[model samples]
Target: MRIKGVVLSYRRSKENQHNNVMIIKPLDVNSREEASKLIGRLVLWKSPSGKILKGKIVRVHGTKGAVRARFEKGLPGQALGDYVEIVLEHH
Candidate 1:
């Protein structure tokens, strides 16, 4: 199954940015109960449409809708505040 969301931002610090990491908000869900469900699922960062650009949701950021995903490759600046397609289930 497939789900979708906006790429919110990179994991940013006061003076630095983590380029390969993305913060995402999925389907606008604000419920606090489903982070575990999302965890370990696959995610696709859809620009350039490259292989290994796909990744996984690692953790939920606290009790909010924001979630963290990390990719093997560095996503470019154009990908910030963009979108991601998530794989909801594994076959």
Candidate 2:
């Protein structure tokens, strides 16, 4: 989803060891993907505890109302509604 907002917060689930987030994205879903490229460059999730859950934009893999963010430990049931901040990386 295309969102324009700063990092808000995040929470870690002990039972699942997954982190959840709450963000303010103007667009509910980010649909920018390519066959050779990915959803974006950076994927960051802020926790309520002020910690950031850094992830990579693997690809957009999921149905609408629910997008999949592939990262370590693949939390299929955790990427929903989680606040995500994206950006372009310059070298």
Candidate 3:
């Protein structure tokens, strides 16, 4: 089965901004170890306009299993807190 996650926020730092970096929390991952397993996986989000936004799991965000992803053109503001589909590619 595919894993599911939600868009928490975009990557940011003190007084600066990094666009296209998304912080995602997967439904099945709760630790950094579990989050590591998701590296290289595909994340998909459907925009309100019906456009499919795709991203890739890049790295672990924090002690929690939340991960960081980079999407093409970035996601819309409405995508925050929205569920994203995690696609597991068959090897």
Candidate 4:
């Protein structure tokens, strides 16, 4: 199944920032239980320049069905509020 999610925000701390960690909310998931099922799923996004970035769902970020993903590299600034594709494959 392919799920859709949005890059909501970056995980950060004062004086320390990293775009590799992104807060995402899956449009089809409405609860933590449903969100947990997506853990370890593959997340993909394409940059404006046609560069495809990949990431994995690490864990649920909040009670609102949001998730935390760690990408192979820090996503570009333009990725903010952008949509990401979740590719669900049997593990």
The 10-residue segment with the lowest total lDDT in model 4: 10-19
Per-prediction CA RMSD (Å): 4.1, 7.1, 3.7, 3.2
Q: For candidate 4, give the lDDT.
A: 0.75
Q: What is the TM-score of each candidate against the true structure?
A: 0.72, 0.41, 0.77, 0.79
Please, what are the lDDT tens digits per residue for candidate 3 over residues 30-52?
89888888888777777677777
Candidates arranged by TM-score, highest first: 4, 3, 1, 2
Q: Write model 1 residue lDDT over 1-91, tens digit each, in one string.
A: 6667788777532324333677888875455566557887888877655544777777877777677877655555455667778787543
The whole-model lDDT of each prediction reads: 0.69, 0.39, 0.74, 0.75
Off by over 4 Å in 3: 11-19, 73-75
lDDT of 3 at 56: 76
Top candidate, metric lDDT: 4
lDDT of 3: 0.74
Candidate 2 — which residues are off by over 4 angstroms? 1-37, 62-67, 70-82
Candidate 1 clash pair list: none
Candidate 4 per-residue lDDT over residues 1-91, each given as its tens digit: 7888888876542324443677888898869988898898888866556776787888897668887877775645455788888889547
Clashing pairs in 2: 1-29, 1-30, 9-46, 9-47, 9-48, 10-46, 10-47, 10-48
Better of 1 and 2 by lDDT: 1
TM-score of 4: 0.79
